[PDB]
């Protein structure tokens, strides 16, 4: 062949933290179909928003938005349990079909994005060199989102484990733990990675008895 059809830019979706998660990498030959399974961010979440992105930046907002759609009717469940399979399918004609399917209900929604959508050749070149000019700032952004997500995991899981502990937890411990979750929740709203890390560390330092109870509960 003298020619190939390739994706000039990565394609994916926005996930928690405002990050672009890639489903089809830059320079993949088409046709191609890739899938990954995602889940919900909150307890009792009834819907997910699939925000489709084109580009090479780690921040969703710095990539080109190809569309969005919602999948509703997710049944009540703890965060992280539902399985929402997202498939990106680019056919021989260069048309992108994005679908999200809830594997519990079998419910599905799609967006179709015609071959002409997204960034033109001048923006494509601008995008590739911006991703390169910014590899460092994007890395620091990725590390901050990762920290924030781990802190949100620690916040939520520790709250669930305080509740399952009930009176097994000594009152001194619960006071220390609860003041530290308040401090973590507050830090999570900011942009200071070391402050988040500091509040996570304080929670680990005051939660050793809680950790022991929760381990024993399922041991």
């Amino acid at each position: 062949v003298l020619l190939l059809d390739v994706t000039p830019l990565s394609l994916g979706i926005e996930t928690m933290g405002g990050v672009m998660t890639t489903l089809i990498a830059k320079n993949t030959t088409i046709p191609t179909k890739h899938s990954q399974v995602f889940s919900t961010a909150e307890d009792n979440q009834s819907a997910v928003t699939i925000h489709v992105l084109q580009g090479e930046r780690k921040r969703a907002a710095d990539n080109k938005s190809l569309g969005q759609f919602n999948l509703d009717g997710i049944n009540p469940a703890p965060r992280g349990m539902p399985q929402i399979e997202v498939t990106f399918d680019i056919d021989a004609d260069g048309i992108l079909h994005v679908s999200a399917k809830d594997k519990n209900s079998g419910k599905e929604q799609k967006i179709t994005i015609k071959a002409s959508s997204g960034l033109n050749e001048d923006e494509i070149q601008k995008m590739v060199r911006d991703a390169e000019a910014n590899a460092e700032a994007d890395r620091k952004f990725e590390e901050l989102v990762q920290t924030r997500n781990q802190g949100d995991h620690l916040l939520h899981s520790t709250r669930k484990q305080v509740e399952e502990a009930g009176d097994k937890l000594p009152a001194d411990d619960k006071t220390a733990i609860e003041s530290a979750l308040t401090a973590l929740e507050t830090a999570l709203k900011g942009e200071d990675k070391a402050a988040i890390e500091a509040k996570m560390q304080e929670l680990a330092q005051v939660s050793q008895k809680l950790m022991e109870i929760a381990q024993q509960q399922h041991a």
């Binding site: 979706i13 926005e14 995602f38 889940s39 997500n149």
Partner: peptide, 5 residues
């Protein structure tokens, strides 16, 4: 409405 990995 966010998704996680």
């Amino acid at each position: 409405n966010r998704l996680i990995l």
